[PDB]
Amino acid sequence: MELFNRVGRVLKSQLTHWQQQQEAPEDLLERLLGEMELELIELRRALAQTIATFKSTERQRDAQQLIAQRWYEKAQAALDRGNEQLAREALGQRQSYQSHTEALGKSLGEQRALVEQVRGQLQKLERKYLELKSQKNLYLARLKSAIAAQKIEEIAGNLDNASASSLFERIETK
Amino acid sequence: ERKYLELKSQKNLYLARLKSAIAAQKIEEIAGNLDNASASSLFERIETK
Amino acid sequence: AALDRGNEQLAREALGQRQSYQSHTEALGKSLGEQRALVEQVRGQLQKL
Amino acid sequence: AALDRGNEQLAREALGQRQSYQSHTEALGKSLGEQRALVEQVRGQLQKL
Amino acid sequence: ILELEAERELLNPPPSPLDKKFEQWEEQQAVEATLAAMKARRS
């Protein structure tokens, strides 16, 4: 097909490596792990975005509790002389401010466990990627060494069996 | 409007959660293909050779 | 830094981590026992060949 | 300047700093133990070669 | 700042009260060694 011939340069280059892949996986293996490194630099930034959002929620709690303290200060201006009457309203507001503060604080307890578990998930996974890089480097060495060994056995078998019998039996008959 | 403010906080944290989950999905799926497909190809093809 | 004065409390966590570090160290050391035998046998294979 | 008259109070901070200075000094000194062995072994490598 | 702190907690273990007290005792032991030198010269 003319279409096939047109596609031939791109397809047959890949297939020429495809038959080679037993000798040469290196490019496809490192391409995939390169993509895995491109992901993993995202995964670390996504962890940093989660930590940033967790403590920003906590900074909003820091503001809520600061306004609760501002409600205690306004109470303190009436908590002497027995004039605590206005403390009724001031602490009445602070009760709602404490409820949001502890809603934040307990959300921030789950968000804590999230940043801890995601850090442990990452540190296990990326350490496994590091050791898997070590294994891959050692696997390309093993593969090339096996290939070389195969070449010594096969060339040695042709050298001894084909060449040497040709030497001994042809020299003897002559 | 205070609910809108806290909902903005949640949305920002939800986009972070979503992107982080997506990344996690990519590590599991690429790790499963790396260990299962690649490693069996390494061990069983090296052993047979 | 906590194994004097009877303050070894923190040694609980510190050695708790070291236990996982020793497991990877001895996993490496025993992989490196096979990798030893590989470099020895490949050297003998080569020197014969 | 504070180790006489029992005025050693300021020695708390002064030796508190020196502790960090000694740690870097002995980090250097033990790096310089390896760097010693490097200059010795490289000198023996050269003189043989 | 939180983004900078995410790199802080990558470069730096959380300074818990435990290691903080150990470092304080280290300073205490440095001064206790200076005191030992003081009273040994005074002997």
Method: cryo-EM
With an 8 Å Cβ cutoff, are B24 and A36 in contact? no
Q: What tokens appear for A116 in the block?
A: 């801890």
Q: What tokens appear for D39 in the block?
A: 């200059």
D11 touches chain E (CB under 8 A): yes
Show residues of chain C in contact with A156, CB under 8 Å.
49
Cα distances (Å, whole numbers) of residue C48 to A73, A152, A153, A167, C41: 90, 11, 12, 23, 11
Cα distances (Å, whole numbers) of residue B15 to A45, A49, B9: 13, 9, 10
Sequence-distant (≥ 6) Cβ neighbours of residue E7 within 8 angstroms: A48
Find the discontinuities in chain D where C to next N exceeds 2.5 angstroms and give the residue preceding each: none
d(CA E7, CA E1): 10
Question: Tokens 């909902």 map to which residue?
Answer: B7
d(CA A107, CA A57): 9
B12: annotated binding-site residue? no
Cα distances (Å, whole numbers) of residue A127 to A33, C27, E19, E32: 14, 14, 26, 43
Show residues of chain A in contact with B27, CB under 8 Å.
39-40, 43, 125
In terms of CA atoms, which chain E residue is nearest residue A53?
E2
d(CA A37, CA C17): 27
Show residues of chain E in contact with A52, CB under 8 Å.
2-3, 6
D12 touches chain E (CB under 8 A): yes
Subunits next to B (3 or more Cβ pairs <8 Å) are: A
d(CA A29, CA A19): 15
d(CA A53, CA B9): 8
DSSP calls for A36-76: HHHHHHHHHHHHHHHHHHHHHHHHHHHHHHHHHHHHHHHHH
Show residues of chain A in contact with E9, CB under 8 Å.
51
Contact A115, A99 (CB under 8 A): no
Contact A86, A78 (CB under 8 A): yes
With an 8 Å Cβ cutoff, are E3 and A47 in contact? no
Cα distances (Å, whole numbers) of residue D4 to A125, D9, D17, E38, E42: 58, 11, 20, 9, 11
- Output the known binding site of A for ADP: 44, 133, 158, 160-161, 163, 165
Measured in angstroms, the CA of D7 and the nearest CA of chain E are apart by: 12
With an 8 Å Cβ cutoff, are C49 and A152 in contact? yes
B49: annotated binding-site residue? no
With an 8 Å Cβ cutoff, are E2 and A55 in contact? yes
Compare CB distances from B13 to A40, A57, A118 and report the shortest one's residue: A57
The three-state (H, E, C) secondary structure of chain C, written as one string = CCCCCCCHHHHHHHHHHHHHHHHHHHHHHHHHHHHHHHHHHHHHHHHHC
With an 8 Å Cβ cutoff, are A156 and C49 in contact? yes
DSSP calls for A67-107: HHHHHHHHHHTTSSTT-GGGHHHHHHHHHHHHHHHHHHHHH
Q: What tokens appear for D36 in the block?
A: 């010693």
Sequence-distant (≥ 6) Cβ neighbours of residue B38 within 8 angstroms: A29
Contact A51, A118 (CB under 8 A): no
Resolution in A: 6.5
A118 touches chain E (CB under 8 A): no
What are the b/e assignments for A146-172, b being 16+ CB within 10 Å?
eeeeeeeeeeeeeeeeeeeeeeeeeee
CA nearest A58: which of C44, E16, D49, A50?
A50
Q: What is the DSSP letter of E16?
A: -
Show residues of chain C in contact with E19, CB under 8 Å.
10
Q: Which of D8, D10, D15, D25 to mutate to test the interface with E (most CBs of E within 10 A)?
A: D15
Q: Is A18 left (phi over 0), alpha (psi -120 to 50) or beta?
A: alpha
Measured in angstroms, the CA of B19 and the nearest CA of chain A are apart by: 6
Would you call D18 helix, strand, or coil by DSSP?
helix
With an 8 Å Cβ cutoff, are D19 and E26 in contact? yes
Handedness of CA A158, A163, A164, A165 (dihedral sign): positive
In terms of CA atoms, which chain C residue is nearest residue A146?
C42
